[PDB]
Design a protein around this nucleic acid. Structure first.
Ligand SMILES: [Zn+2]
Lengths: 49, 38, 267
DNA sequence: AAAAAAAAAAAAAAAAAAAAAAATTTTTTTTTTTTTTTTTTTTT
DNA sequence: AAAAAAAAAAAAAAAAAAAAATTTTTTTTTTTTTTTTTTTTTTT
């Protein structure tokens, strides 16, 4: 969790997939929205309310 | 009368340095890093 | 889930369109339509003996199962009053059908309003007891978003008697962008609402017994037609109410009488 | 005819019934992507 | 004739998807009870 500097040789680079930094979710009954939540960057998930 | 819910409002801030001041000092770094010699 | 056709509804609406069609006869119901159009009143009072003589089976069907039957009746009424005057028929989103006549077995009193007469247009004489404040009920509510210069019209269905869902009961206050919505009260549409309580007359009631009373929900068109103490004959649909949501129910179903019309029993 | 006493009325406070209101993530499955192995078909 | 390219089949693993789920408490309402005022009724 501290910034580190490293050398190396890349061998496999996956395809650019779209990951979400900010989202919005609608309620199925009342149809109101929680606009612009912030997704914590990284490979960090997010449990819905 | 109870048919609405207008939003909250707030105002600009009038008055280990806090993360807002570290934000300010990063802003200063970008705004004032002078590289070219006189 | 729009219905393509139903033989029952089509048949009933045809029968009542014929019943309203009064030219080959003396013109009684056509005259009633013309005078109510001239009055701007929007309820037409159809005699049950007339309905019975012209078609006894429809009278039996209606006096056994009201609400959908009267939906057919009122749609026929809207079509008919549109043929007489489309401009006036466009004016009101609904028109209504009051009743009158010899409700032979369907004339009881609130002591004798048993659980046999549900969804049946019952006739009942009695004395008022209460007069709740005649307060509005919202039916079609318009909103304005000033951030997005937007307007919306949420729509409400008068499910005073059927099952009602929160999705139907939502009153919107924010847009999809969580902006503030301001209600447009004037552009919205409302109907009056009053509760009253009919009671078995003490001159009619059993001598030594407690009173018995029935609740009556007068929506628009019947706001101030019944104050406390008055003698009133109420004809309308005894039904059941929905308990508000909750995983449990006792069997209790507090019942009402959504009055189809009320007249001065003093005569 | 007016005073005293009693009864009823009006209004506030309390006790129970029954209908409403609120809270409320974690573990298992299984499809899909990827790799691997044995075989047959084809080429040198 | 030997090598190798391709084919089908089998397996592992990671990402997404599937599924499971009543109880306790609070608040309105109704109904009586009690106090005190007002009213009415009986007495000298
Ligand atoms: Zn919702």
């Amino acid at each position: 969790s501290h910034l580190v500097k490293i050398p190396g040789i890349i061998i496999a680079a996956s395809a650019v997939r779209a990951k979400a930094t900010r989202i919005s979710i609608q309620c199925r009954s009342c149809r109101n929205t929680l606009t612009n939540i912030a997704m914590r960057p990284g490979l960090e998930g997010y449990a819905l309310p | 009368s109870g048919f609405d819910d207008p939003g909250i409002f707030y105002s600009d801030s009038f008055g280990q340095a806090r993360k807002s001041q570290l934000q300010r000092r990063f802003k200063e770094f970008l705004r004032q890093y002078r590289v070219g010699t006189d | 889930t729009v219905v393509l056709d139903d033989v029952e509804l089509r048949e009933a609406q045809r029968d009542y369109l014929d019943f309203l069609d009064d030219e080959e006869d003396q013109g009684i119901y056509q005259s009633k339509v013309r005078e109510l159009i001239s009055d701007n009143q929007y309820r037409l009072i159809v005699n049950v003996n007339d309905l019975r003589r012209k078609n006894e089976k429809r009278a039996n069907r209606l006096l056994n199962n009201a609400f959908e039957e009267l939906v057919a009746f009122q749609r026929a009424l809207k079509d008919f009053v549109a043929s007489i005057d489309a401009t006036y028929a466009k004016q009101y989103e609904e028109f209504y059908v009051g009743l009158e006549g010899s409700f032979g077995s369907k004339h009881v009193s609130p002591r004798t309003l048993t659980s046999c007469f549900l969804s049946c247009v019952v006739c009942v004489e009695g004395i008022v007891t209460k007069c709740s404040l005649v307060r509005p009920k919202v039916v079609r509510s318009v909103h304005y978003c000033p951030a997005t210069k937007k307007t919306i019209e949420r729509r409400y269905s008068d499910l005073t008697t059927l099952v009602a869902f929160p999705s139907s009961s939502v009153y919107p206050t924010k847009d999809e962008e969580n902006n503030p919505l301001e209600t447009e009260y004037g552009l919205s549409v409302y109907k009056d609402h009053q509760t009253i309580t009919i009671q078995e007359m003490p001159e009619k009631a059993p001598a030594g017994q407690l009173p018995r009373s029935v609740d009556v929900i007068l929506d628009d068109d019947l706001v101030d037609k019944a104050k406390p103490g008055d003698r009133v004959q109420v004809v309308g649909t005894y039904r059941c109410l929905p308990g508000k949501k909750g995983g449990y129910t006792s069997g209790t179903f507090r019942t009402v009488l959504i009055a189809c019309n009320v007249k001065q029993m003093s005569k």
